[PDB]
Enzyme design. Sequence first.
Site, short mmCIF file in Angstrom:
data_model
loop_
_atom_site.label_atom_id
_atom_site.label_comp_id
_atom_site.label_asym_id
_atom_site.label_seq_id
_atom_site.Cartn_x
_atom_site.Cartn_y
_atom_site.Cartn_z
N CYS A 107 7.11 -3.97 -18.55
CA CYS A 107 8.34 -3.22 -18.29
C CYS A 107 9.57 -3.91 -18.85
O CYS A 107 9.92 -4.96 -18.40
CB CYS A 107 8.54 -3.00 -16.79
N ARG A 110 13.27 -4.47 -16.33
CA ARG A 110 13.31 -5.27 -15.10
C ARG A 110 14.65 -5.93 -14.68
O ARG A 110 14.78 -6.36 -13.52
CB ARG A 110 12.17 -6.30 -15.08
N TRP A 279 14.89 5.34 -15.58
CA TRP A 279 15.35 6.17 -16.68
C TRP A 279 14.72 5.78 -18.01
O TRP A 279 14.22 4.66 -18.19
CB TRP A 279 16.89 6.19 -16.76
N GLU A 284 10.94 5.78 -26.16
CA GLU A 284 9.81 6.45 -25.55
C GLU A 284 9.71 7.92 -25.97
O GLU A 284 8.63 8.40 -26.25
CB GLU A 284 9.92 6.36 -24.05
C1 HEM Z 1 15.24 1.72 -14.59
C2 HEM Z 1 15.01 1.93 -15.88
C3 HEM Z 1 13.67 1.60 -16.54
C4 HEM Z 1 13.47 1.45 -17.83
C5 HEM Z 1 14.54 1.56 -18.92
C6 HEM Z 1 12.08 1.14 -18.03
C7 HEM Z 1 11.47 0.94 -19.23
C8 HEM Z 1 10.10 0.86 -19.39
C9 HEM Z 1 9.41 1.06 -20.65
C10 HEM Z 1 10.07 1.39 -22.00
C11 HEM Z 1 8.11 0.88 -20.41
C12 HEM Z 1 7.03 1.02 -21.48
C13 HEM Z 1 6.66 2.50 -21.40
C14 HEM Z 1 5.64 3.01 -22.40
O1 HEM Z 1 5.72 2.69 -23.62
O2 HEM Z 1 4.75 3.79 -21.96
C15 HEM Z 1 7.94 0.56 -18.99
C16 HEM Z 1 6.77 0.27 -18.33
C17 HEM Z 1 6.61 0.10 -16.96
N1 HEM Z 1 7.62 0.20 -16.00
FE1 HEM Z 1 9.63 0.32 -16.42
N2 HEM Z 1 11.43 1.12 -16.83
C18 HEM Z 1 12.40 1.41 -15.89
C19 HEM Z 1 12.20 1.48 -14.53
C20 HEM Z 1 11.04 1.16 -13.88
C21 HEM Z 1 10.83 1.32 -12.45
C22 HEM Z 1 11.87 1.87 -11.46
C23 HEM Z 1 9.60 0.88 -12.18
C24 HEM Z 1 8.91 0.84 -10.80
C25 HEM Z 1 9.65 0.92 -9.68
C26 HEM Z 1 9.01 0.50 -13.43
C27 HEM Z 1 7.77 0.01 -13.56
C28 HEM Z 1 7.09 0.00 -14.73
C29 HEM Z 1 5.68 -0.24 -14.80
C30 HEM Z 1 4.70 -0.50 -13.61
C31 HEM Z 1 5.34 -0.17 -16.28
C32 HEM Z 1 3.92 -0.34 -16.87
C33 HEM Z 1 3.52 0.98 -17.53
C34 HEM Z 1 2.04 1.20 -17.55
O3 HEM Z 1 1.23 0.21 -17.48
O4 HEM Z 1 1.69 2.42 -17.63
N3 HEM Z 1 9.89 0.68 -14.47
N4 HEM Z 1 9.19 0.55 -18.40
C1 XFJ Z 2 -4.36 4.54 -20.62
C2 XFJ Z 2 -3.12 3.99 -19.96
C3 XFJ Z 2 -3.05 2.70 -19.40
C4 XFJ Z 2 -1.86 2.25 -18.79
N1 XFJ Z 2 -1.74 1.01 -18.24
N2 XFJ Z 2 -0.80 3.09 -18.75
C5 XFJ Z 2 -0.87 4.34 -19.29
C6 XFJ Z 2 0.32 5.25 -19.24
C7 XFJ Z 2 1.38 4.59 -20.07
C8 XFJ Z 2 2.59 5.47 -20.00
C9 XFJ Z 2 2.62 6.61 -20.80
N3 XFJ Z 2 3.70 7.41 -20.77
C10 XFJ Z 2 4.75 7.12 -19.98
C11 XFJ Z 2 4.76 6.00 -19.16
C12 XFJ Z 2 5.96 5.74 -18.28
C13 XFJ Z 2 6.99 4.90 -19.00
C14 XFJ Z 2 8.24 4.67 -18.18
C15 XFJ Z 2 8.22 4.47 -16.81
C16 XFJ Z 2 9.41 4.26 -16.13
C17 XFJ Z 2 9.41 4.06 -14.65
C18 XFJ Z 2 10.60 4.23 -16.82
C19 XFJ Z 2 10.58 4.44 -18.19
N4 XFJ Z 2 11.73 4.42 -18.92
N5 XFJ Z 2 9.41 4.65 -18.83
C20 XFJ Z 2 3.66 5.15 -19.16
C21 XFJ Z 2 -2.02 4.81 -19.90
#
Ligand code: HEM
Ligand code: XFJ
Lengths: 403, 405
Positions: A107, A110, A279, A284
């Site tokens: 993420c 953070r 957000w 993305e």
């Molecule tokens: C607040 C603004 C936030 C931004 C800008 C942000 C940004 C991102 C981005 C760009 C990713 C990679 C997404 C992808 O390529 O699929 C990600 C992953 C992740 N975010 Fe954040 N995020 C935000 C908030 C949060 C919040 C609120 C949480 C949980 C409370 C969170 C938890 C996670 C987790 C658990 C992942 C791992 C994704 C996965 O394994 O599927 N994020 N975040």
């Molecule tokens: C196979 C697989 C494995 C894995 N760990 N995650 C995924 C889903 C990954 C994934 C795909 N599209 C969207 C998201 C969410 C990304 C996301 C989440 C939050 C909270 C904020 C933000 N700006 N962006 C995550 C798929």
Amino acid sequence: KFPRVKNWELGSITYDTLCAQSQQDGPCTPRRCLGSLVLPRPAEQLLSQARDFINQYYSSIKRSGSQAHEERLQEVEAEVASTGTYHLRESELVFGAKQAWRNAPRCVGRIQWGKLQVFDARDCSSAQEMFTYICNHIKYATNRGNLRSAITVFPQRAPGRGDFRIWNSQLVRYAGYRQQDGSVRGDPANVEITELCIQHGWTPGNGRFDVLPLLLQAPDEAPELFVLPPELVLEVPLEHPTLEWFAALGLRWYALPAVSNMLLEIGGLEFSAAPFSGWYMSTEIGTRNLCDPHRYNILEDVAVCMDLDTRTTSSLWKDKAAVEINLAVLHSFQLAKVTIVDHHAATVSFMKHLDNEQKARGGCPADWAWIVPPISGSLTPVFHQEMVNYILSPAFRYQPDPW
Amino acid sequence: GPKFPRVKNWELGSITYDTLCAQSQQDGPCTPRRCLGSLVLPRPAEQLLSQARDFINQYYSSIKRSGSQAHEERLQEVEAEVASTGTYHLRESELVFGAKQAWRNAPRCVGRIQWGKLQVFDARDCSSAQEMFTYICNHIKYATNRGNLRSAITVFPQRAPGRGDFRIWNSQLVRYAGYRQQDGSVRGDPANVEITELCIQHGWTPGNGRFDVLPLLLQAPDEAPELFVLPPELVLEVPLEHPTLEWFAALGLRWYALPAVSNMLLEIGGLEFSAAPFSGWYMSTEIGTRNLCDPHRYNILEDVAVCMDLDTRTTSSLWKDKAAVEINLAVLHSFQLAKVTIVDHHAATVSFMKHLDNEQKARGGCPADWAWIVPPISGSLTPVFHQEMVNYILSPAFRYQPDPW
Ligand code: HEM
Ligand SMILES: Cc1cc(N)nc(CCc2cncc(CCc3cc(C)cc(N)n3)c2)c1
Ligand code: HEM
Ligand SMILES: Cc1cc(N)nc(CCc2cncc(CCc3cc(C)cc(N)n3)c2)c1
Ligand SMILES: C[C@H](O)[C@H](O)[C@H]1CNc2nc(N)[nH]c(=O)c2N1
Ligand SMILES: C[C@H](O)[C@H](O)[C@H]1CNc2nc(N)[nH]c(=O)c2N1
Ligand SMILES: [Zn+2]
């Protein structure tokens, strides 16, 4: 023992000591790095995880070793000894959830980890109720475009009884309709969830951006379908600051990235339905969602509109178009007054986050392949930053599809 | 089912299992507790024999003669020699095989589809720094081939017990000077401030420009390094221009044609070739994105965006991205105009996918460093981005080695 972590743009060095707090092994071994894989395949266990988590709780409020700490440690001892499990107090849950985001190595957002609205929905007993809670989440988190990060925590898992689950991978998602011609109208990633919705009785639309319904499951019951009230789901029409034709493409995206298929583990308890949102980062939507070949795949279209030599990789029509798309995404969101962060701004904040965590904990778990954006990687300062990856708890985990 | 890492491509949904990694006889920096996969630098009696035995076995397999009489005789011969001199020597064809094999084995090289086409110049007879100079000139001549570049390596004599090393002090055969300024800034390439300073110390008369070709510091065994200047007719350069932005040519930017690593160690069956410079041709992102746009290199992103009349005051104009694309486009265009081999990051990555498929057939896996394979611009626009990769150390190998000073 303690990994040295260099920044190659500034020559600065740190050491990571946070990593010794890792109790759960990853995929790598000395023989081979599997760092790039998306996923690899008693009541003492739960008791020590609970102890450990309670400790992290009382330490976080600087009441470590005091009376409330001892008597709450006893409370848990007493609960597991009797029932094989135990329950968390609301503020402890508020701690875990925040800490699970803090620990999320994939993420980039953070810096925000402290600012998280937390809805306790542990008194949920029906899909019906789940839907209500999900609807308040969306309303809270959207805030007419001033997005606020939220989580909603449904009831924990329990020995020999089905999980509460949200079948949907995000709360807001566009349908994927498998056409006769073998092509896909709509979003290709969602073909299968679209099919389940239809199998469970939904009347489909036939557009490219049809908001999917939710399939909500209460323990040991068939999932139930619920349509999101269309006025709750904020959407942003896409257009381009200078290219007049872009808007005609009729492209759009939804404001709220809310994950809904992930497990939240706190102190050994598992929360199988625990959706969270913050957000979007413009890449993305502009890079992955619209530009992936196995997504909406709009690159060629756009580049031809742009009137670019498509006949050759050396003209960089892909890179040119990709930039315009990302720009259209930022402009459009900023125009409709909806929170968005660009990948430059986001990775700058990330670097400061590494620094805060360095002072605070002795490091920060981080997954380099996920933290570096899908375009212009080396143009952001994360690209040059070494990063150490490891699993801390409280954590989010991937969990397998409920069907 | 399989007892080996499963490897998935997320674009096509195809699956392979890496069985080659079982061959790795050297440990990397990861453990089950933590992944260090993005560190740039991660932290002899019986030993030699077994590395040697393993390479010979590798050679006889590649010639489909595994178990044969020549094979066990070569093994016998190699042991006889170690149990006498403490070292041993490669035959000509063994050296050609190990060199190609080390390029084949390199996890961080996106260009490995070309691995089987490598000109291996033997130089294990080389005995002075003058002679090193000669060999190097020949190499540059051959590889540059007036723009029609050809992959090559030149192998100098191996590490010996109680004799100093052959070393090329320069990290690359061709590099620009970086002159530390009065006002703290750097004129030229900041990557090369040290080597520049070391050259002046050993007698070079420095220039005063942004693109001055450095001289060579070459070190024969046990001697001081001697300095050598490459004749300018030997160093092919490309003046940079944009296909449509007319003002771009006025920036006086330029790059050299021949990417030639010169500071790496080449390890084959435990023998160490401390001076074995190798070269190929550029991928355009290297020049256009890393060298020209890194903040700690030439850093021209801002100058260019200003020329492009972009809003540099705010991130969200994606001024960095727009300028970076043009700079890349200018790199491609100018090399193409000047008829100097180059490959764009799109074509380069496609062919690596094809390289992955081949290797899957031939060896059952391919060691690859995701963070280094994916290009520094337009990452997910390239198929490598969606390909999981396993990374591990095979030998023959090229290793980083610390500077000799
Ligand atoms: C607040 C603004 C936030 C931004 C800008 C942000 C940004 C991102 C981005 C760009 C990713 C990679 C997404 C992808 O390529 O699929 C990600 C992953 C992740 N975010 Fe954040 N995020 C935000 C908030 C949060 C919040 C609120 C949480 C949980 C409370 C969170 C938890 C996670 C987790 C658990 C992942 C791992 C994704 C996965 O394994 O599927 N994020 N975040
Ligand atoms: C196979 C697989 C494995 C894995 N760990 N995650 C995924 C889903 C990954 C994934 C795909 N599209 C969207 C998201 C969410 C990304 C996301 C989440 C939050 C909270 C904020 C933000 N700006 N962006 C995550 C798929
Ligand atoms: C023929 C065209 C070639 C191309 C397009 C190519 C491309 C690349 C690229 C883009 C990198 C990353 C370098 C960086 O980011 O600084 C790299 C690294 C590397 N290349 Fe290749 N290469 C080619 C030929 C060769 C040859 C002939 C060899 C050796 C015989 C070689 C061996 C290596 C090695 C060992 C690395 C890792 C270098 C390091 O760790 O510092 N390549 N290559
Ligand atoms: C600390 C450190 C470690 C390490 N392993 N490499 C380096 C230098 C990496 C490096 C920098 N510029 C250039 C190169 C070689 C690029 C290169 C080499 C060849 C043969 C072909 C081609 N297209 N490109 C390598 C530094
Ligand atoms: C195979 C590879 O690890 C995979 O495509 C990863 C690469 N980096 C990523 N980074 C982010 N932020 N999101 C992703 O989905 C991915 N995909
Ligand atoms: C921190 C990170 O590992 C480091 O900056 C790497 C990333 N990927 C790279 N990839 C290539 N090809 N070359 C590099 O110099 C780098 N730098
Ligand atoms: Zn690893």
